[PDB]
Amino acid sequence: SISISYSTTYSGWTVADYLADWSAYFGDVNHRPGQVVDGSNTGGFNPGPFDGSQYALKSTASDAAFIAGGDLHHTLFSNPSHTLWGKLDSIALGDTLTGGASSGGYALDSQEVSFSNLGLDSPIAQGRDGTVHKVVYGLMSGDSSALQGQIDALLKAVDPSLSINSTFDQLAAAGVAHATPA
Ligand code: HEM
């Protein structure tokens, strides 16, 4: 089942409110045709260059950042082009991205919330319609809607009374979330 980690700072927030606010602040990195600048709005893979166990991206305007973890593959110019696919196990949100391929991995200096055991598996043939792609490209674009939808389904599968409209404290009482120090 989904497992959620959250700083006690967010104990009284709903998941939906936290994610809406986090993504709005992160913003859109404008990873779109004509606007991609390597080292500015591409993010990076570990070990990379275009595959690995992590993909991480910091905002173009502040130190907010996220890390996607799993077994990830990116097609770049190969068909179907510009698709992230593979197995997505986790999304960690916070600020101050540390590490990189030269460090052996990425980590957030201030991890606010993480969602693990996501169990999302997207074949390459689904291209940009795959869930893995939509979740991560959404986050790159400042839009947590796809992530919210996947969390909501995982929470309902535990119990239909649980949803993205539950608070982190409610999800902890329900056995799917645990707090970390502020
Ligand atoms: C090392 C990481 C990455 C690099 C170097 C990279 C590079 C690029 C480049 C060069 C373009 C084309 C810009 C243009 O046509 O002018 C592009 C577009 C795009 N990339 Fe990436 N990308 C990276 C990561 C990702 C990831 C992780 C995703 C998805 C989760 C993604 C999804 C897309 C999409 C959807 C487009 C737009 C394609 C279109 O509308 O034609 N990219 N990227």
Question: How many structural domains does the chain have?
Answer: 1
Which ligand 1 atom minimizes the distance to the CA of 57?
Answer: 27
User: Do β-strands 105-116 and 64-74 pair in parallel, antiparallel, or remain unpaired?
Assistant: unpaired
Its domain, for residue 135, covers 1-182
CA pair distance 182, 164, nearest whole angstrom: 21
Which ligand 1 atom minimizes the distance to the CA of 34?
Answer: 16
Determine contact, residues 45/101, Cβ cutoff 8 Å: yes
Q: Is the CB of 42 under 6 A from ligand 1?
A: yes
CA pair distance 146, 124, nearest whole angstrom: 18
Q: At what angle do helices 15-26 and 145-158 cross, to 10 degrees?
A: 160
> What determination technique applies here?
X-ray
User: How many other CB atoms sit within 10 Å of the CB of residue 172?
Assistant: 16
Among 29, 30, 31, residue to substitute to test ligand 1 (most atoms within 8 Å of Cβ): 31
Pair of tokens at residue 5: 């980690």
CA pair distance 29, 62, nearest whole angstrom: 11
